Design a protein around this nucleic acid. Structure first.
Lengths: 226, 85
DNA sequence: TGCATCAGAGCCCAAAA
DNA sequence: TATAATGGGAGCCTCTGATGCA
């Protein structure tokens, strides 16, 4: 495989003769494709948290859970989502959508969820006071493609809804594998905290899994069709 | 010409094979411990099955004559091991 | 099937050195 | 027993019979 080019087919995949394995590489025979020494291991970590949101009651669609991509609300006019606590802002941006975490004396006092269609008006590490706008919400706002909503609780106060969302999403982290390291974990494996993913000559060069996640192999040196 | 049909190893491939070879020898030592069997005798049985039925012969160091009967017998003790062993 | 091509088979004795 | 090393190197007559070819 040409250096840096990533494969189309996945480790284990049945392949027909003539099928294209890589941008410039075409398989000459049918059989099972096997990745030859993966250069980059990507671990998608499983995170399950609790985050809040407040919306105009007329703008929100009632549901018990929200699947990825689903429309959460549709706003007739732009809405300023405001902080309900004072704190310093920890901004954590996902692929699409964002997380916002207010903390005062260390201990996080709030976790808010900004879906797509909501542009943060604050930056990481910004001091906010109760009531100042965190994010603008304009038009249709929906769940991001990479993040789900397992449970949706709703309290109604005045003209707004406050959603307490139980959210599940995966955060990618890339690890580089050197020629002297071997991947000891299969594609699609389930790992807990402490499980070894890549091994190396010495202990400080090993890659140990930080928490729960699933493993994906990318950019192999070559593909072996057997 | 025959030499030229085996591609040269990449640094990765070279390290991988060497690594697997070292790990395999450590395994044979370990398999010796578990079974209480001669490490060399075990090694010839392991090696016999990889090279195939083609090459089976008496080994000067082995105490027992090495023939398909004994490698099947010994292989069956190996196939009687618990999953982690 | 009848013709060509090549591999392999030989190339004096005795004397001497 | 440990830098890395990865594909060689050369040459001076006639008959008979089997073998490989239109």
């Amino acid at each position: 495989l040409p250096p840096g080019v990533d494969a189309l087919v996945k480790d284990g995949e049945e392949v027909v003769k003539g099928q294209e394995l890589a941008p410039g590489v075409v398989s000459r025979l049918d059989g099972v494709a096997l990745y030859r020494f993966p250069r980059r291991v990507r671990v998608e970590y499983v995170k399950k948290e609790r985050a809040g949101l407040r919306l105009p009651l007329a703008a929100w669609v009632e549901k018990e859970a929200y699947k990825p991509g689903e429309i959460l609300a549709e706003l007739p006019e732009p809405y300023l989502f405001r902080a309900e606590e004072e704190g310093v802002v920890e901004l954590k941006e996902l692929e699409e959508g964002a997380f916002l975490v207010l903390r005062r004396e260390d201990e996080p006092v709030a976790t808010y969820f900004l879906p797509v269609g909501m542009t943060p008006l604050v930056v990481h590490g910004e001091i906010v006071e109760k009531g100042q706008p965190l994010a603008e919400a304009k038009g249709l706002l929906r769940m991001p493609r990479q993040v789900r909503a397992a449970q949706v609780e709703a309290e109604e106060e005045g003209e707004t809804v406050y959603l307490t969302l139980f959210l599940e999403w995966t955060e990618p982290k890339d690890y580089r594998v050197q020629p002297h390291m071997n991947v000891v974990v299969p594609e699609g494996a389930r790992v807990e905290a402490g499980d070894k993913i890549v091994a190396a000559i010495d202990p400080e060069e090993e890659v140990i899994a930080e928490a729960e996640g699933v493993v994906h192999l990318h950019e192999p040196a070559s593909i072996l069709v057997v | 010409h025959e030499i030229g049909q085996v591609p040269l190893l990449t640094l990765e491939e070279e390290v991988e094979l060497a690594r697997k070879v070292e790990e395999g020898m450590e395994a044979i030592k370990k398999l010796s411990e578990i079974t209480g069997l001669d490490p060399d005798l075990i090694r010839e049985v392991v090696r016999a099955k990889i090279l195939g039925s083609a090459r089976v012969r008496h080994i000067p160091g082995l105490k027992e004559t090495l023939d398909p009967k004994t490698v099947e017998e010994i292989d069956q003790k190996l196939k009687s091991l618990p999953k982690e062993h």
